[model samples]
Target chain A: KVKQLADKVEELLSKNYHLANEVARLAKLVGER
Target chain B: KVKQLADKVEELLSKNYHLANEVARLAKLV
Candidate 1:
């Protein structure tokens, strides 16, 4: 199940990058204020 | 093994962030 398990990582992995971009963007506006 | 197989991998692969340069730019404006 290594591949299947990696799928989960890849799943959360996707969420993470999305979160990363948003987090950085969030930091930008928050910092502006 | 079946009960917690993903959990094993999950713990091992929990912290691999790949965002590098983008955050820097974001920080610059802030």
Candidate 2:
């Protein structure tokens, strides 16, 4: 089972990073604007 | 180990809402 437990960190890094950044940017804009 | 292994990991990731928020915030900051 350990062998099957592979981490797809790259996808998480890319997709989740973009999502977080977008959300934060929107939140900041909403607060300021 | 077999009985509670996967369940613990799933619970740790799901119930750990703080990690998700921290991760998102750190990503935003960085």
Candidate 3:
């Protein structure tokens, strides 16, 4: 059960990282504008 | 097992929503 939680958290973190990157890009673009 | 997995996923989704909202706010700010 603990291992499962860890794996799920890891997956969410990876997905969140990608989302954060995308958000950063959009923020940069808006800043430039 | 399936119920537990679903609960975990739901928790993650809630967290993601908050994170995404914050990001969107910052994005709009900039």
Individual DockQ of the candidates? 0.17, 0.12, 0.27
Compute the interface RMSD for each candidate structure: 5.9, 7.5, 4.6
Better of 2 and 3 by lDDT: 3
State the lDDT of candidate 1 residue by residue for B1-30, as single tens digits.
544767755653554343444555566666
Comparing 1 with 3 on TM-score, the higher-scoring candidate is: 3
- Candidate 1, residues A1-33, lDDT tens digits: the string is 667876776677676667687766768686774
Clashing pairs in 2: none
Each model's TM-score?
Answer: 0.48, 0.38, 0.56
Task: Report the poorest 10 consecutive residues by lDDT, candidate 1 chain B.
Answer: B12-21
| Per-candidate clashes, comma-separated | 0, 0, 0
> Which model scores highest in TM-score?
3
Q: Which stretches of candidate 3 lie over 4 Å from their true place?
A: B1-15, B23-30
TM-score of chain A of each: 0.66, 0.56, 0.69
lDDT of each: 0.62, 0.52, 0.78
Best by DockQ: 3
Candidate 2 lDDT by residue in tens digits, A1-33: 532332333334455556666666656755673
What residue pairs clash in candidate 1, if any at all? none
